[PDB]
Amino acid sequence: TDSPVLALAKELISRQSVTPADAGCQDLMIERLKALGFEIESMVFEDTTNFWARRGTQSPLFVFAGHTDVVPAGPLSQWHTPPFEPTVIDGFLHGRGAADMKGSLACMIVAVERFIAEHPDHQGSIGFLITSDEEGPNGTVRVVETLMARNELIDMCIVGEPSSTLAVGDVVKNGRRGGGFLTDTGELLAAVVAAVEEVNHQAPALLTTGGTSDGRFIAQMGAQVVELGPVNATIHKVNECVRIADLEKLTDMYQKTLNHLLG
Ligand SMILES: [Zn+2]
Ligand SMILES: [Zn+2]
């Protein structure tokens, strides 16, 4: 039987959540998080479902952000495997969303599970901010404005978009907090770099620009933001896939980031 990482990633992949459809992916995540003490707030905007979940009431607020939607399969004649059927071949998990970004979502859930099991008494708070419209040419903005307008301000945020080139964690992208005009302690990037170095024994390359508008918005509003996720060589393409070993590594990097920040 699978690791909980692969088991959950497979589950997510099976749900045909073509933008902006969620197809029940968020309910899967919400069930896992409800079991860990998270309060959940579902929020629909336009044709999209979103949610915000939080565990803890104390500073800092650390958040995992991402989307459940995926882009269309493209030509089925080109697909070696059924696009919405998670298909394991030679150590790789094939399917729409494997890399962008249902793999990372499963890694976020199991990392928080493992962390909350080792550190039930963690500092700070853990949040999830999940949307289903990211591949569009709205949801993030609407959720973030809701949190701001009730003075619930994310301190630090990992966006699990697939940031990597050859191997998971070889690149991460760093947001500029408030566009580079708010003070920035570097506490998040230090934590993530620390985690990536433990796992890979190599520092990631850094980009300071170029991520998603979604993450750029979170940073502009005041969060420290880092994008860290799987290899992106196959995103939005036929025969999208992810190295399963890299999903185990990413889960560890997320758990280790949590240790450094909260544990
Ligand atoms: Zn994405
Ligand atoms: Zn995408």
Author numbering: 2 to 138, 141 to 266
Task: Reproduce, without paraphrasing, sentences from the article in which this PDB structure was first reported.
Two VcDapET structures were determined, the apo- and the dinuclear Zn(II)-loaded form. The two V. cholerae structures are virtually identical and superimpose with the average rmsd of 0.25 Å for 265 equivalent Cα atoms suggesting that binding of Zn(II) does not induce any major structural changes. Likewise, the structure of Zn(II)-loaded VcDapET is almost identical to that of the catalytic domain of the full-length HiDapE with rmsd of 1.15 Å. The similarity between these structures is especially apparent within the active site region of Zn(II)-loaded VcDapET as the active site structure differs by only ∼0.45 Å rmsd with the active site of HiDapET and ∼0.4 Å with the WT-HiDapE. The active site of Zn(II)-loaded VcDapET contains a (μ-oxygen)(μ-carboxylato)dizinc(II) core with one terminal carboxylate and one histidine residue at each metal site ([ZnZn(VcDapET)]), that is identical to the active site observed for WT-HiDapE. Based on the best fit, an ethylene glycol molecule was modeled in the active site resulting in a distorted tetrahedral coordination geometry for Zn1, which is bound by the carboxylate oxygen atoms OD1 of D101 and OE1 of E164 as well as a nitrogen atom NE2 of H68. Zn2 adopts a distorted trigonal bipyramidal geometry and is coordinated by the bridging O2 oxygen atom from ethylene glycol, a nitrogen atom NE2 of H239, two oxygen atoms, OD2 from D101 and OE2 from E136, and the O1 oxygen atom of ethylene glycol. The Zn1-Zn2 distance is 3.39 Å. Identical to CPG2, HiDapE, and AAP each zinc ion is coordinated by one imidazole group (H68 for Zn1 and H239 for Zn2) and the oxygen atoms of E164 for Zn1 and E136 for Zn2. Both zinc ions are bridged by D101 and a single oxygen atom of ethylene glycol (in the molecule one, chain A) and a water molecule (in the second molecule, chain B).
